[PDB]
Design a protein around this motif. Structure first.
Motif, PDB file in Angstrom:
ATOM      1  N   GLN A  55      -6.866   1.213  -7.197  1.00  0.00           N
ATOM      2  CA  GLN A  55      -7.079   2.534  -7.058  1.00  0.00           C
ATOM      3  C   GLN A  55      -8.159   2.603  -6.062  1.00  0.00           C
ATOM      4  OE1 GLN A  55      -5.164   4.907  -7.487  1.00  0.00           O
ATOM      5  NE2 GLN A  55      -6.294   6.698  -6.422  1.00  0.00           N
ATOM      6  N   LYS A  56      -7.886   3.477  -4.837  1.00  0.00           N
ATOM      7  CA  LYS A  56      -8.774   3.564  -3.579  1.00  0.00           C
ATOM      8  C   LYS A  56      -9.240   5.120  -3.617  1.00  0.00           C
ATOM      9  CE  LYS A  56      -8.765  -0.689  -2.713  1.00  0.00           C
ATOM     10  NZ  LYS A  56      -8.405  -0.822  -0.964  1.00  0.00           N
ATOM     11  N   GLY A  57      -8.386   5.947  -3.361  1.00  0.00           N
ATOM     12  CA  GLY A  57      -8.407   7.503  -3.377  1.00  0.00           C
ATOM     13  C   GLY A  57      -9.067   8.040  -4.609  1.00  0.00           C
ATOM     14  N   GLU A  58      -9.480   9.179  -4.475  1.00  0.00           N
ATOM     15  CA  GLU A  58     -10.256  10.126  -5.471  1.00  0.00           C
ATOM     16  C   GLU A  58      -9.045  10.568  -6.462  1.00  0.00           C
ATOM     17  OE1 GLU A  58     -11.624   9.517  -2.689  1.00  0.00           O
ATOM     18  OE2 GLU A  58     -12.847   8.526  -3.642  1.00  0.00           O
ATOM     19  N   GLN A  59      -7.982  10.502  -6.070  1.00  0.00           N
ATOM     20  CA  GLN A  59      -6.799  11.255  -7.040  1.00  0.00           C
ATOM     21  C   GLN A  59      -6.713  10.453  -8.261  1.00  0.00           C
ATOM     22  OE1 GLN A  59      -6.438  13.988  -6.321  1.00  0.00           O
ATOM     23  NE2 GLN A  59      -4.947  14.636  -7.978  1.00  0.00           N
TER      24      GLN A  59
ATOM     25  N   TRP B 186      -1.877   4.160 -20.047  1.00  0.00           N
ATOM     26  CA  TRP B 186      -2.982   3.741 -19.455  1.00  0.00           C
ATOM     27  C   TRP B 186      -3.322   4.664 -18.092  1.00  0.00           C
ATOM     28  CZ3 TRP B 186      -5.677  -0.548 -21.477  1.00  0.00           C
ATOM     29  CH2 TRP B 186      -7.013  -1.060 -20.733  1.00  0.00           C
ATOM     30  N   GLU B 187      -4.564   4.857 -17.883  1.00  0.00           N
ATOM     31  CA  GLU B 187      -4.937   5.960 -16.589  1.00  0.00           C
ATOM     32  C   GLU B 187      -5.803   5.064 -15.758  1.00  0.00           C
ATOM     33  OE1 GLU B 187      -6.345   9.549 -17.566  1.00  0.00           O
ATOM     34  OE2 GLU B 187      -8.273   8.812 -18.412  1.00  0.00           O
ATOM     35  N   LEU B 188      -5.742   5.229 -14.599  1.00  0.00           N
ATOM     36  CA  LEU B 188      -6.733   4.601 -13.638  1.00  0.00           C
ATOM     37  C   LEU B 188      -7.533   5.731 -12.803  1.00  0.00           C
ATOM     38  CD1 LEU B 188      -5.260   1.281 -11.707  1.00  0.00           C
ATOM     39  CD2 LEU B 188      -6.738   1.707 -13.731  1.00  0.00           C
ATOM     40  N   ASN B 189      -8.695   5.493 -12.737  1.00  0.00           N
ATOM     41  CA  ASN B 189      -9.559   6.394 -11.929  1.00  0.00           C
ATOM     42  C   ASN B 189      -9.824   5.894 -10.834  1.00  0.00           C
ATOM     43  OD1 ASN B 189     -10.827   8.876 -11.938  1.00  0.00           O
ATOM     44  ND2 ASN B 189     -12.344   8.542 -13.319  1.00  0.00           N
ATOM     45  N   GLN B 190     -10.830   6.521  -9.887  1.00  0.00           N
ATOM     46  CA  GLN B 190     -11.272   6.007  -8.644  1.00  0.00           C
ATOM     47  C   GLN B 190     -12.203   4.716  -8.822  1.00  0.00           C
ATOM     48  OE1 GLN B 190     -13.844   5.170  -6.674  1.00  0.00           O
ATOM     49  NE2 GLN B 190     -13.066   5.921  -4.569  1.00  0.00           N
ATOM     50  N   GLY B 191     -11.668   3.499  -8.188  1.00  0.00           N
ATOM     51  CA  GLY B 191     -12.263   2.427  -8.228  1.00  0.00           C
ATOM     52  C   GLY B 191     -11.842   1.479  -9.512  1.00  0.00           C
ATOM     53  N   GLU B 192     -10.996   1.881 -10.103  1.00  0.00           N
ATOM     54  CA  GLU B 192     -10.624   1.136 -11.289  1.00  0.00           C
ATOM     55  C   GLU B 192      -9.491   0.149 -11.017  1.00  0.00           C
ATOM     56  OE1 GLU B 192      -9.948   3.968 -14.242  1.00  0.00           O
ATOM     57  OE2 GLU B 192     -11.768   3.839 -15.055  1.00  0.00           O
ATOM     58  N   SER B 193      -9.304  -0.795 -11.951  1.00  0.00           N
ATOM     59  CA  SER B 193      -8.013  -1.797 -11.729  1.00  0.00           C
ATOM     60  C   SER B 193      -7.375  -2.095 -12.934  1.00  0.00           C
ATOM     61  CB  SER B 193      -8.614  -2.988 -11.103  1.00  0.00           C
ATOM     62  OG  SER B 193      -7.747  -3.835 -11.069  1.00  0.00           O
ATOM     63  N   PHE B 194      -6.214  -2.648 -12.807  1.00  0.00           N
ATOM     64  CA  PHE B 194      -5.380  -3.060 -13.953  1.00  0.00           C
ATOM     65  C   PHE B 194      -4.863  -4.465 -13.937  1.00  0.00           C
ATOM     66  CE2 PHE B 194      -1.512  -2.841 -16.628  1.00  0.00           C
ATOM     67  CZ  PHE B 194      -2.306  -3.139 -17.976  1.00  0.00           C
TER      68      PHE B 194
ATOM     69  N   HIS C 229       0.761  -1.080  -0.073  1.00  0.00           N
ATOM     70  CA  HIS C 229       0.060   0.031  -0.147  1.00  0.00           C
ATOM     71  C   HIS C 229       0.717   1.101   0.106  1.00  0.00           C
ATOM     72  CE1 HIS C 229      -3.518   2.530   0.700  1.00  0.00           C
ATOM     73  NE2 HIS C 229      -2.860   3.194   1.711  1.00  0.00           N
ATOM     74  N   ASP C 230       0.284   2.296  -0.649  1.00  0.00           N
ATOM     75  CA  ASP C 230       0.939   3.519  -0.682  1.00  0.00           C
ATOM     76  C   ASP C 230       0.118   4.498   0.039  1.00  0.00           C
ATOM     77  OD1 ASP C 230       2.561   5.784  -0.953  1.00  0.00           O
ATOM     78  OD2 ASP C 230       2.476   5.791  -3.329  1.00  0.00           O
ATOM     79  N   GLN C 231       0.425   5.444   0.757  1.00  0.00           N
ATOM     80  CA  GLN C 231      -0.336   6.325   1.456  1.00  0.00           C
ATOM     81  C   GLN C 231      -0.594   7.963   0.799  1.00  0.00           C
ATOM     82  OE1 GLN C 231      -0.457   7.079   5.639  1.00  0.00           O
ATOM     83  NE2 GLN C 231      -1.561   5.111   5.955  1.00  0.00           N
ATOM     84  N   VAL C 232       0.476   8.280  -0.018  1.00  0.00           N
ATOM     85  CA  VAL C 232       0.412   9.679  -0.682  1.00  0.00           C
ATOM     86  C   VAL C 232      -0.649   9.589  -1.707  1.00  0.00           C
ATOM     87  CG1 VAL C 232       2.733  10.534  -0.062  1.00  0.00           C
ATOM     88  CG2 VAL C 232       2.462   9.019  -1.936  1.00  0.00           C
ATOM     89  N   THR C 233      -0.899   8.540  -2.568  1.00  0.00           N
ATOM     90  CA  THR C 233      -1.831   8.422  -3.481  1.00  0.00           C
ATOM     91  C   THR C 233      -2.921   7.266  -3.107  1.00  0.00           C
ATOM     92  OG1 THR C 233      -0.435   6.665  -4.476  1.00  0.00           O
ATOM     93  CG2 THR C 233      -0.221   9.081  -5.306  1.00  0.00           C
TER      94      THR C 233
END
Lengths: 673, 600, 673
Positions: free
Chosen positions: C149-153, C265-273, C120-124
């Motif tokens: 992806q968990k946070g809204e960034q 590729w870009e990841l939005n909130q709640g997406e996965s790769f 896990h990473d906390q900044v993002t």
């Protein structure tokens, strides 16, 4: 070109590009100093304990512990001998060793000779060393000669012509070897601490698995730059080429006659001669060294009355040993001459004096096939003189006639000359396809055994001498089926001899040392075009039946004969062979011929295996003259010399794909303006 | 065992590890069929000129066109010869060579011998070929003998000891060459059409230039896997080791005495004996061949006395000096001497007069005696038909002098110096004299046992020299207490290093700058290992030297001479981690380490 | 087979043949410790223990990293710095399955294990999961990764590598498989030197067209029988990048994955790769054992069920029929040539009533279909001009887009409409073009960075739906180019298309692919027998014209079909491939197949260049039990296994000469007693 600095007791062999330094040690022997590129003359090279010095002719039985070069055996059973300098003299022009073939010089200021004499005290024998230097060529020759002045009976068991030493062990041996149908392949190996050598023991003929040639080149040397040393030996019997190195990093290479069964014996008033070696130095590459051999052998060694002319176009014929019908032969040639335009027709086997005149009057020459042996059934010599056959008593015989004895020689010469005196034969072909077994002579004392091989070789030499000095207008082939007499001596007597991917590899291997003219190539029954393209370079011939070929083939062979008749003057007698690509480490071969004034050329490109979807090709020539507007043909365009040598000729690899399969080839022709 | 298969006339010999096969052909000569890994038994191996076939004792002049292994000159002046099989027989054991040294068997269930008799009718001479197979080891020995029954004289010009052929040239010759102060450097070369060989013509010294031993290995064979062949000649005179490959890719090696100045005359009822050759096969690398040779030499070759016994520590340059007994067991100037019995400028041992004179002169004054020779030979002539036998007779003379001395005094231990490091001396003199010494010891260990070499410490620190000198016979030539500690260590492990152990080579001084070896007990209970660097580096990667020849089972205690415990497997794969610049630079260049591997 | 030592915080995966050993560092990253031969489990490995020098599982640039990174993510701040730390782990049994892509599976849940570790990473506020799998009774390990992806960034991915393995020393070699078409999948091996060595594939579609996605790493002395070798494979079909890199501190690092040249590729909130899967195999016996492990694993646990055990059928093709739309000539063909010769599958190239007629004769039916290609004229173009792939104001020269779902559903509807009425049982898909201007006219600016990875998933799901609707149809995933030859297609299509320049292609490609997948064929310089002797190994097929053929050939084709029908059970479904001689060194080739129990076998060898006066040869085989007696040649004899492996089978070189020229083959068969 030879000067003797008396103060230091040293010699100097000048040339335009070759130097050789020698010195007389305190003990009285001879020591080498330098051998290579030319050196400006200096009055004192002083600033430059056996086993640690470079000798000219080492002898066993002292502090030296390496392989020797000479070995004598006295009556009291000893192998100890030594001897020192007593006298020398400087001469001008080659003299020539009588019993053996050698090179020669025409004018007087063409060569120089130095002879130094060394004498032994305990056994009272003499040894004379001869050096020779050629002006305008980077070539040096040497040999040796033994003479006995005292009463003692000595026996020679080891005698080598040459011995050269270096101070560095970083080199790369080169040799030519291979079995029949794949002979004279190029092999190279790295020098390692110990002994490396090649030899031959076939007896009757020269090396059938190895060739009397050896080179010594730097690891980085290629076809266009680098150092190289070359040694060649003029003999037809057993030989030995040895190159050993020591743990002190010194190299010693020697050539000579094989001591495996040498037991020559001398008496008072007798003398012994040894074959000579030819050494060439090149600082530009194997191309330069090969050109030196080609020029020297073509000019200074081959028999006169054949050095300027071009060889004829032979036309043998295969068959099933038919009868001696006269009409078919005469009709055949008429077809061949009238249509194809060849200039020589040869008959084989025995299937005849009257036939000779008819062929000559038709407009073409004549030739025969001869072999010199005997059969235990019908030769009538077996029931006339059984002892003339070779072979020891009480040993099974597995025949070859004994040429050691002079009577046999005379019998054949008087017999064969009876046939070469009434007919118009202008071409003959010698054959030998047997190996000597059980080398024992029934016409010699037990003490005279061991001279048999050398006497046999001397006998075949003097038979050739008598025959060719009696009938100096005919041509000779060395061998027909053995393919193992490809040495310079036979070239001295017989001007040529007998040797498609196999052919390309063989010719590329054998062009290192022998000239292109001496190679004999033929076209046999892959389209005819590639065979002609590979058989153009060398002697050109045909082995075909005119009935079995259609009219298109007749037109093709007419065109081929016209082309060869046009270009054979350039290819054979006035040209320089250049090797461009190698059949080894690749699958493409290429070479070309350039005139002596840089005005005409012929380049060829060959392929061994087809490649699909491959890359395109650039074909870079060499040897041309920069700044001369050449005109390339075979589709014509003009190009300068430098850019043609540097960027090469484009090759469209689909074009050769149309030419055929797996054996495509191309030719190109150049001009002056 | 050996069988003769009278139906097809085939001889099969095997130790259950290898299988060699011969066959009596039509003209009465012998052939070779296969030599290598052991195979089972069938009844008819029939499906498997003379210049293309494979023969095991070639002769020139009958269609063969390669270098021969035999050449005899007859009165008629001829040099032709033929031999044919007449009879054969089988022994159990090893009768041995009366006049020459050879390996000896003790019990009769240890080896089996085959002898084949070949007869020539024109000269009435007998040829006997002898084969021996050892049980429990993969070795084979060969030799030959000549007998004359007729009346006329014959002269031997060339007599070899062995001739082995193969069917492919894909190999890589391994030789053992060097000069003074740098002897026995390992060198490799690739076989190619022609002849490549090593010889020696020095004189009395046994192989001053190249050691009489060659190998023959596959290109891919490393120290841990692959095939390899080994040939060793038990002789002290001039020798020769050819290796010729023809144009049909048929290799043929041969060993024997040098024919340069050899000419032996055989009269009626006389005999001649040739030196014996030893062959070894291995399918797991050079190490297996090394242990085979090591175990064999010190098992059935070295004297029966100095076998189960360790070697005495020694010191070189009186009672006041000898009062310094820091653990030293023997002094040289118990007591030991040094003599030179061959120089006066060289004696002639071929005759028996000098032998008897020196024997009496030495026995008059006769537990450790040396032997020195500093000159090779010069002017090989003796004061007319026996002039060619001088070298062989000189060798036989020194041999019989050694026999007489060692039969008289059975306890005195002798050494040797000059390099005459042949397998001959070891039979009479059980041990011999020999940074830079790292490469010399590495090369010598391919064939000779570790106890053979005599190491010494001269007057960089002393610890590295001690470390390199432990392996072998330990000797000498604020700081004294360290010397007491050194001899304390050496007296603890010599019962393992000297007698019961196996030598393993791990790294190589050639193609690198490290060197590593170690020894292991018969069972996997103890071990000692060492790792020598040469020139220190900078910014080098981490180190993890592993171990081999070790049990993959129980534990071990790696006492880094800090102790940790580990299993055999890891020690095989992961290795012992070494921290550069922490302990190696702690002493400087030429750094060395030791380790111990006690079991429980 | 997985144990977590919480006291020391280190994992241990072992399989009684291999052992992977990991550790958790103080700062929250994962450090490798060992990978190789199996190790008995100990209580702690403390002694086995500056970020650039440690060995890290999943390196990230920045934070002291200076080598090439493995992951790169861009944030809205413009920064490119991330780090991860361990929070948890999980252990269970059996493979689970990556839903979007293909992967291996386990059928019994006692044949595999699994380890999942979360970082896990906390900044993002993003999560990363690393998965490890071990197969029991196989020396194989797999691994991949997954992003959440968990946070809204918002984050954008630019690098995503499937794996990264790293060692301690540079003493290795690189074994790659690379070539152009018609000479594809050769073997080139290359040493390791300080710097970067890599292979890659930037072809838009198909991929693997000049570099197959496979790489090995073997010791310099490793041969086919002994040595230590590592293997890496990637289950993917698009652009890949296999990179091996070494540092000045002598520490290698090898990594696989997707080519990042056009990956945005870009990841939005709640997406996965989800990233592809790699397969790792370690062998201590040699390349033969490594290849056997791959062959068994791919044939059993990756190829689609219902085809893993049945043998492939003999097929016949007709392309030489030119193009005429007549009828009843095909009926006459299938009636009295194909059926009589004994071929059970008849493939028609380029309605529905004809298919039923063919089945009456007792044969199956086939068809050819190109799916992803359109012509401007095609109705699709006139009605839907944007469905194509390209960019505005740019020329191009037509590939059909699969990024959009509309095209996929349209194509699926059309093809399913075609298949339902007919009785088709064999389909060959085709693709013979590359992708140019990779731009999509359906997405916005942000999404124009993922089309190349998107349509691969599109075609994957197209086959998914098609093969799940029709689970009885064989597929052939190539017709021209041979560039779609990779494990994923094998998961979907069991096999695919592929004398001299064929016995070398097959030898090269048999490292990492079972012989069932070979699409060998016979087509009509060379005799038919030598072509059949190569086409036997692999799927057997015919591409001829039986109308134009003589009776002598039709009498031999029946024997060939009988032989193949006899031995195809052994050759394909249960057998071990063994390589004996290699064409990249000599001029011969040899291999054999052995049954699972040493009961029977088949062997052969070939030569490429005819030889004369050559040496003896002892063709020796291996991979066989030294138990009992068996031999048959084509008469027969008997031999033990050990003797047969060690002395080999004698070959008389004269026998090859009469069996044609320059391409000679032999076949051998073994038995039990």
């Amino acid at each position: 070109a030879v000067i003797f600095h008396e103060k230091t007791k040293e010699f100097h062999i000048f040339n335009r590009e070759v130097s050789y330094l020698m010195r007389i040690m305190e003990n009285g022997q001879l020591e080498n100093l330098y051998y290579g590129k030319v050196i400006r003359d200096k009055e004192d090279f002083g600033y430059l304990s056996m086993q640690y010095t470079r000798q000219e002719y080492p002898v066993y039985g002292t502090g030296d512990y390496r392989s020797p070069a000479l070995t004598v055996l006295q009556e009291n059973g000893s192998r100890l001998v030594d001897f020192s300098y007593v006298s020398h003299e400087i001469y001008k022009g080659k003299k020539g060793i009588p019993p053996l073939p050698s090179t020669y010089a025409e004018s007087e200021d063409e060569a120089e000779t130095l002879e130094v004499t060394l004498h032994d005290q305990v056994t009272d024998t003499d040894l004379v060393l001869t050096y020779t230097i050629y002006e305008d060529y980077p070539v040096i020759t040497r040999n040796a000669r033994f003479e006995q002045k005292g009463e003692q009976k000595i026996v020679l068991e080891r005698a080598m012509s040459a011995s050269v030493e270096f101070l560095d062990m970083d080199y790369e041996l080169v040799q030519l070897s291979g079995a029949w149908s794949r002979e004279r392949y190029v092999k190279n190996r790295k020098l390692e601490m110990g002994i490396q050598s090649v030899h031959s023991l076939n007896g009757t003929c020269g090396g059938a698995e190895h060739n009397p040639f050896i080179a010594l080149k730097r690891p980085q040397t290629t076809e266009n730059q680098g150092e190289v040393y070359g040694f060649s030996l003029v003999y037809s019997g057993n030989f030995l080429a040895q190159a050993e190195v020591s743990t002190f990093d010194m190299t010693r290479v020697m050539l000579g006659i094989n001591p495996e069964d040498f037991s020559w014996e001398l008496n008072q008033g007798e003398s012994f001669q040894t074959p000579e070696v030819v050494m060439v130095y090149s600082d530009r590459g194997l191309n330069k060294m090969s050109q030196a051999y080609h020029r020297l052998y073509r000019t200074r060694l081959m028999r006169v009355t054949w050095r300027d002319k071009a060889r004829p176009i032979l036309l043998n014929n295969w068959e099933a040993t038919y009868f001696d019908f006269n009409e078919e032969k005469i009709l055949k040639i008429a077809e061949k001459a009238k249509e194809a335009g060849v200039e020589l027709f040869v008959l084989d086997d025995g299937w005849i004096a009257g036939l000779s005149r008819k062929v000559e009057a038709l407009g073409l020459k004549f030739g025969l096939w001869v072999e010199l042996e005997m059969v235990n059934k019908d030769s009538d010599l077996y029931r006339a003189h059984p002892d003339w056959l070779i072979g020891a008593p009480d040993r099974f015989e597995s025949h070859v006639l004994d040429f050691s004895r002079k009577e046999v020689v005379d019998y054949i010469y008087k017999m064969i000359a009876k046939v070469l005196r009434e007919s118009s034969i202008s071409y003959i072909k010698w054959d030998m396809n047997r190996y000597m077994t059980e080398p024992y002579s029934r016409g010699a004392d037990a003490s005279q055994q061991g001279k048999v091989m050398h006497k046999y070789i001397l006998g075949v030499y003097d038979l050739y001498t008598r025959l060719t000095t009696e009938f100096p207008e005919i041509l000779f082939e060395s061998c027909a089926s053995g393919g193992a007499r490809f040495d310079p001596a036979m070239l001295y007597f017989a001007p040529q001899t007998w040797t498609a991917s196999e052919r390309t590899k063989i010719q590329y291997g054998t062009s290192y040392v022998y000239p292109v003219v001496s190679m004999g190539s033929h076209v046999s029954a892959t389209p005819i075009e590639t065979r002609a393209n590979v058989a153009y370079f060398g002697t050109f011939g045909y082995e075909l039946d005119l009935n079995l070929l259609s009219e298109a083939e007749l037109e093709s062979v007419k065109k081929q004969i016209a082309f060869m008749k046009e270009y054979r003057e350039l290819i054979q007698v006035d040209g320089d062979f250049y090797r461009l690509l190698s059949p080894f480490e690749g699958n493409e071969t290429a070479w070309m011929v350039v005139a002596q004034d840089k005005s005409r050329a012929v380049a060829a490109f060959y392929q061994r295996m087809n490649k699909v979807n491959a890359s395109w090709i650039r074909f870079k020539l060499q040897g041309l003259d920069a700044g001369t507007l050449y005109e390339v043909s075979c589709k014509t365009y003009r190009a300068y010399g430098d850019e043609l040598m540097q960027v090469g000729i484009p090759i469209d690899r689909e074009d050769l794909n149309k030419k055929g399969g797996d054996f495509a080839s191309l030719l190109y022709t150049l001009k002056k303006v």
